[PDB]
């Protein structure tokens, strides 16, 4: 598909698509780069995650709009407007599931299995938790518990490695904790675990800031502020 383009050209075009805010193109260029079979560098893993996080973030936001319309349409006293809202929410839902399945597929074939370094392994397992969590946001049927547990299992293995192999200030460790905390709060119905995790993560990072350069400090404090934003919202 992107099979005939050079890996380096795909990478270069992903960067151009990012500059152009063309995230669907960005994601397809990065998908092509992953399918070349070589491991991704730090920079390239970042492009991969930014492309999909934007594509799926757009589909999730639209799904939420449509879901909220569909819920109002189902309230007592609501005029029957036919199947259209549910159909079009399903259409957006299907496309979003397809994007999650695409990313999960890239992680399983074969990014995770070849990722030996903590910074690559934790990154990819965080993505695995994130995309199962997006599937969980829309899941309503037989598989919901297993989708939730898949998100949990991926975040958990990422947390276990990151606690062993990464400093408490590492941005990947902080972003993973941020998202796993959101998973607990809104997917797993465990707001206490979500709060505890955000708090402990924030405090352990505070105590390690002193080891950092000014640039590392700014990187870590950026995501710490997201932890604090959630603690503020939730407490």
């Amino acid at each position: 598909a992107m099979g005939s383009m050079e890996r380096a050209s795909l990478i270069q075009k992903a960067k151009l698509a990012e500059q152009a805010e063309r995230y669907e193109d960005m994601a397809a260029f990065m998908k092509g780069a992953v399918e070349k079979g070589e491991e991704l560098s730090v920079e390239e893993r970042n492009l991969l995650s930014v492309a999909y996080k934007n594509v799926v973030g757009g589909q999730r936001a639209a799904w939420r709009v449509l879901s909220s319309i569909e819920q109002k349409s189902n309230e007592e006293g609501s005029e029957e407007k036919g199947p259209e809202v549910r159909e079009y929410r399903e259409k957006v839902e299907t496309e979003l599931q397809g994007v999650c399945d695409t990313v999960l597929g890239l992680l399983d074939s074969h990014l995770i299995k070849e990722a030996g370094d903590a910074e690559s392994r934790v990154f990819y397992l965080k993505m695995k938790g994130d995309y199962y969590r997006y599937l969980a946001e829309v899941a309503t049927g037989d598989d919901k518990k297993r989708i939730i547990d898949s998100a949990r299992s991926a975040y958990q293995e990422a947390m276990d490695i990151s606690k062993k192999e990464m400093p408490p200030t590492h941005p990947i460790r902080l972003g993973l904790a941020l998202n796993f905390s959101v998973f607990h709060y809104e997917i797993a119905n465990s707001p206490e675990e979500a709060i505890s995790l955000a708090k402990t993560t924030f405090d352990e990072a505070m105590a390690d800031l002193h080891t950092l350069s000014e640039d590392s400090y700014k990187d870590s404090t950026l995501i710490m502020q997201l932890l604090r934003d959630n603690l503020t919202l939730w407490t």
Partner: peptide
């Protein structure tokens, strides 16, 4: 507003 993720 909306909780943060990254």
């Amino acid at each position: 507003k909306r909780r943060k993720s990254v």
